[PDB]
């Protein structure tokens, strides 16, 4: 009776949908057909006798992405229509996704989630998965998030952004679209999670010892932190954490709601037998300057708040003892106004592992979503990318020709600009 659902945008979100729903179907025992041979009430919808279907929409303008699902193995699992599909991609453009191509397809996706919303008794919020590349994940979500702000202003609006790394950028216009996308997420979304492609590489390279990590191995990790956030709802726990209180603990201010993520136990199968995983170890593993999935320096940035979500065979005393170790460490600090920066969550469900999965089966695990000033450094790098090319007036005529104005680009930077000062002011 909680009804957490999940919309997906872009091949970033869709291919994560292949991971997130491969994970959930393994948790509940749902076959790939959709028919299981309560927990599923949050994410799925029961139908008929045993048929269950996910409460999601894989909206994506590029038809080549969704056809992998419609030609895949979860064909008879997903409802056919909620795999919304356009005809021409946004082509790494806020403009082509925000206004022009969006108008042709909002009618299909909005009416479907509305068919899911009213069908739900009471829903907590919708999980978004949009990348700041520039295509559907930047502009088409901007129009989508604001139309849901007016439709659903009260409800929580989560998202999981694959933020482009500062050192590496998969496309050329990522410095533009990420800066344009910052406006809709800081004003509408209640807490916006961030992930880097270069960060996840370092985890699975160093720890898991995989020098050829693929997006079916990256997203298989972001599937877990999402499951970690929602396992409090999806399953019972000795100390649960709801989304309305999850974000309440991270968000002291309305604009300061852009945390990072972390998932400590990431180890191979043979690596597991050698090293016993203790609650004080996976806890300390999260606070490393590299184990987090965002390229930043937590030592330089003061932490503001955290929600450690342990899961599996876990007890509360060693969590209470572990966090005591954290406050003693000088490398890990907290801001003066926050005496307590630790929210805690436990549940008896261990993390489920995909068969043939790089991740290992561990009796317990933890995810923590730290809100800190360390993320200002990652953004300062890309704001330098933006104003640099924007000073040259590069690639703007592709946007201006689509309909936007030159003044909008300066306003989006100004919104990001004042956002940087906020982390600096509160840091004092």
């Amino acid at each position: 009776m909680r009804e957490c659902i999940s919309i997906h945008v872009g091949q970033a979100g869709v291919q994560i949908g292949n991971a997130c729903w491969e994970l959930y179907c393994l948790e509940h025992g749902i076959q790939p057909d959709g028919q299981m041979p309560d927990s599923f009430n949050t994410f799925f919808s029961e139908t008929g006798a045993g048929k269950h279907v996910p409460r999601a929409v894989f909206v994506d303008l590029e038809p080549t992405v969704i056809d992998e699902v419609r030609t895949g193995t979860y064909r008879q699992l997903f409802h056919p229509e909620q795999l919304i599909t356009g005809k021409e991609d946004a082509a790494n453009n806020y403009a082509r996704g925000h206004y022009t191509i969006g108008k042709e397809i909002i009618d299909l996706v909005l009416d479907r989630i509305r068919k899911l919303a009213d069908q739900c008794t009471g829903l907590q919020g919708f999980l978004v998965f949009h990348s700041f590349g520039g295509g559907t994940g930047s502009g088409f979500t901007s129009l989508l998030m604001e139309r849901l702000s007016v439709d659903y202003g009260k409800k929580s609006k989560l998202e999981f952004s694959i933020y482009p790394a500062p050192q590496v950028s998969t496309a050329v216009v990522e410095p533009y679209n990420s800066i344009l996308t910052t406006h809709t997420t800081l004003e509408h979304s209640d807490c916006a999670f961030m992930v880097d492609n270069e960060a996840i590489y370092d985890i699975c390279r160093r720890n898991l010892d995989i020098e050829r990590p693929t997006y079916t191995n990256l997203n298989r990790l972001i599937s877990q932190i999402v499951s970690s956030i929602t396992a409090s709802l999806r399953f019972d726990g000795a100390l649960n954490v709801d989304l309305t209180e999850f974000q309440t603990n991270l968000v002291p201010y309305p604009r300061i709601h852009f945390p990072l993520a972390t998932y400590a136990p990431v180890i191979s199968a043979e690596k597991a037998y050698h090293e016993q995983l203790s609650v004080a170890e996976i806890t300390n593993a999260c606070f490393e300057p590299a184990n987090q999935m965002v390229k930043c320096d937590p030592r330089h940035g003061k932490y503001m708040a955290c929600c450690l979500l342990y899961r599996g065979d876990v007890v509360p005393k060693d969590v209470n003892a572990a966090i005591a170790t954290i406050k003693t460490k000088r490398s890990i600090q907290f801001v003066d106004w926050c005496p307590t920066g630790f929210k805690v969550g436990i549940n008896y469900q261990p993390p489920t592992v995909v068969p043939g999965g790089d991740l290992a089966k561990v009796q317990r695990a933890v995810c923590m979503l730290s809100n800190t000033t360390a993320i200002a450094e990652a953004w300062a790098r890309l704001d330098h990318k933006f104003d640099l090319m924007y000073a040259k007036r590069a690639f703007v005529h592709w946007y201006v020709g689509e309909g936007m104005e030159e003044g909008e680009f300066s306003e989006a930077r100004e919104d990001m600009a004042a956002l940087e000062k906020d982390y600096e002011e509160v840091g004092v």
Binding site: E62, T64, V172, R212, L388
Partner: protein
């Protein structure tokens, strides 16, 4: 879905076209009769991009094989994978118009332009959705440069909302099978700077040079040159034509590769190129394909990437690899060759991947790069043009048919204004 027409012109395009479908028919298991025999379904899912689905579960392409003389298409009908084309799309003329641009552009093209604007207007609206327009010509001839330039000029004013592209074989001084190809190319570039938003300035000079050192073949025929260009543009479109771990269609790469409208003249590439003997010794891996495709000798064009700096590049892979080894290297490429890449635009690369490989290989890539090295190309044609234009030679073939003398000075001004912009950002 995201369909697109396919146009030819001259000996070049129609011969490039004959092998453009030699490979794509193999990418889809299509016979020369048009029948589907391939076993995979990933290839058949997006058959609609190039093929009007014909009766008896047959498939035939858009393939507007246009030419001003029938000598080409009379050969293409007999050629392999030639029967699959539609005979209505064999738009022929009486005389080939010669190497005279104006006599292939103004009058004798206008005599035939209405016959080819209707069939494309037929195929265009017949398509559910069109991604753009795509042709294959040369800037040196009169056919590929006269009507092939008029054609796309009239298609943009009829379909300006749609992006497009063109694979123009530019002339060259060494391999110079034409005298007035400066005039033919100087006048076609006058249109292509605005009438097309991405031009792949291939040059027949390099394509021999590649095949001597890299392939080490003793008899490179025109076909063997075309097998590079045919398997090249197939890579540009493989993103939308097949599933991919990360997809870059014609629009997704054109928008983020072209910073300014005038600067859209590219140079393609193709990484795995080996003799039949030296392939076994080379283990083809992403770090080795990558260094193989950023070098000067692999890219097919008459310019030097070392001299001019890169503005934007793209690497459309066709293998089932990891994106780690891809982008860790292409950052290493920009670390080693940091001087060769422009500093204003960080991370000039636009990578793209496809899950399926081509026939026979396990991995493959294509290097599209917008550089200031092609400055030397247009800087050289303006020298050939200016020396031949200072003495008003070969003009009376242009002036008599039409083509007022003022237009020549306008063309060189734009190309001089064109290279003026490359050096401005260099």
């Amino acid at each position: 879905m995201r369909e697109i027409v396919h146009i030819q012109a001259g000996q070049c395009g129609n011969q490039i076209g004959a092998k453009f479908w030699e490979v794509i028919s193999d990418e889809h298991g299509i016979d020369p009769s048009g029948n589907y025999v391939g076993d995979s379904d990933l290839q058949l899912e997006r058959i609609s991009v190039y093929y009007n689905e014909a009766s008896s579960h047959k498939y035939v392409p858009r393939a507007i094989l246009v030419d001003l003389e029938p000598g080409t298409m009379d050969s293409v009908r007999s050629g392999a994978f030639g029967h699959l084309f539609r005979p209505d799309n064999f738009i022929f003329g009486q005389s080939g118009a010669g190497n005279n641009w104006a006599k292939g552009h103004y009058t004798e093209g206008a005599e035939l332009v209405d016959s080819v604007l209707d069939v494309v207007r037929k195929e265009c609206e017949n398509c559910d959705c069109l991604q753009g327009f795509q042709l294959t010509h040369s800037l040196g001839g009169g056919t590929g440069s006269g009507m092939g330039t008029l054609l796309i000029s009239k298609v943009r004013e009829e379909y300006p909302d749609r992006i497009m592209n063109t694979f123009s074989v530019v002339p060259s001084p060494k391999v110079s099978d034409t005298v007035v190809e400066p005039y033919n190319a100087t006048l076609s570039i006058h249109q292509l700077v605005e009438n097309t938003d991405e031009t792949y300035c291939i040059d027949n000079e390099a394509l021999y040079d590649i095949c001597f050192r890299t392939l080490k073949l003793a008899t490179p025929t025109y076909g063997d040159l075309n097998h590079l260009v045919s398997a090249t543009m197939s890579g540009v479109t493989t993103s939308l034509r097949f599933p991919g771990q990360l997809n870059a269609d014609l629009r997704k790469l054109a928008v983020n590769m072209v910073p300014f409208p005038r600067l859209h003249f590219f140079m393609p590439g193709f990484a795995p190129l080996t003799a039949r003997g030296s392939q076994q010794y080379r283990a083809l891996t992403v770090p080795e394909l990558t260094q193989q495709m950023f070098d000067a000798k692999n890219m097919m064009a008459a310019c030097d990437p070392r001299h001019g700096r890169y503005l934007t590049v793209a690497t459309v892979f066709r293998g089932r690899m990891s994106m780690k080894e891809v982008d860790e290297q292409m950052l290493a490429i920009q670390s080693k060759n940091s001087s060769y890449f422009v500093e204003w635009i960080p991370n000039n690369v636009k990578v793209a991947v496809c899950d399926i490989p081509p026939r026979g290989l396990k991995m493959s890539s294509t290097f599209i790069g917008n550089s200031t090295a092609i400055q030397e190309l247009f800087k050289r044609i303006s020298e050939q043009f200016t020396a031949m234009f200072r003495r008003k030679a070969f003009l009376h073939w242009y002036t008599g048919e039409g083509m007022d003398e003022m237009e020549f000075t306008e063309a060189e001004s734009n190309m001089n204004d064109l290279v003026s912009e490359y050096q401005q950002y260099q």
